Design a protein around this ligand. Sequence first.
Ligand SMILES: N[C@@H](CCC(=O)O)C(=O)O
Ligand SMILES: [Mn+2]
Length: 290
Amino acid sequence: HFPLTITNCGVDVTFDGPPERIILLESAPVATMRALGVLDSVVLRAGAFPPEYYDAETNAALRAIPSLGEELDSSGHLQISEEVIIAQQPDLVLGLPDGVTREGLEAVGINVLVQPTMCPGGVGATTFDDVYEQINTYGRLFDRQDRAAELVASLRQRVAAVEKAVEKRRSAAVLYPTIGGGVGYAYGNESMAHPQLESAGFTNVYADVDERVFEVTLEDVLEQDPDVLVLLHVDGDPDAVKDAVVNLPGADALTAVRNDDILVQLFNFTEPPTPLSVDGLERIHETFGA
Ligand SMILES: N[C@@H](CCC(=O)O)C(=O)O
Ligand SMILES: [Mn+2]
């Protein structure tokens, strides 16, 4: 049903038909778009698109989608200007990098969508329903509702299988380390990390933090001393990601470090809510067992 309105971070974003000139400023949408078969709607991309996320054909498609840049900062944030984006005359931009504003894009007729749990301000505790609701939204946006419904059903079944196995409690945290040294950031109950950990049978040590992601010191993580750690990174060498934690002075005081109960995985296997979050759930479950 078009015209379609999507409410996004409080804003009504209206589409008279499916978008045809999309710029991807984040990798999250690709997990759903490749299943719906709508990658031809993407004209440009920016940032990292790890091939580990995708099937071979999708990776070949991405190599043929030109890039507006790949420079990330130490927190994995894309560096790109609003003027560069506007110059391409897109009809839809997915993601808002630092310093790129919804208002600036909307002012010249460009629609903007952000992943709902990355809206500024409170978004409430995240669940696997946030994966499914976003897939159903993409189903409407691209007029692929039947395909979206089949994707949701397949994912729900896989999540149910992990939760059943678990039904037949260790603590955990998910972090985003700083390369060169530092535990960096942790994920609270607005992150996809939170329901991922809980569905895998863990207690999230930051379950009571009503934030998505927040800075932590080693001392902070030590006070929680989670049995297990998951370390995320947008790209680059996972050895350096683990070293950013385990080679810190005093880090051997961590149970997870002593027992080597540490999983390093690429960002979208946890955050934000996408089909890849279900892959991540399975990975955590198979790695640390139940
Ligand atoms: N790119 C990571 C780093 C944390 C941050 O945004 O500061 C995230 O979005 O979760
Ligand atoms: Mn970030």
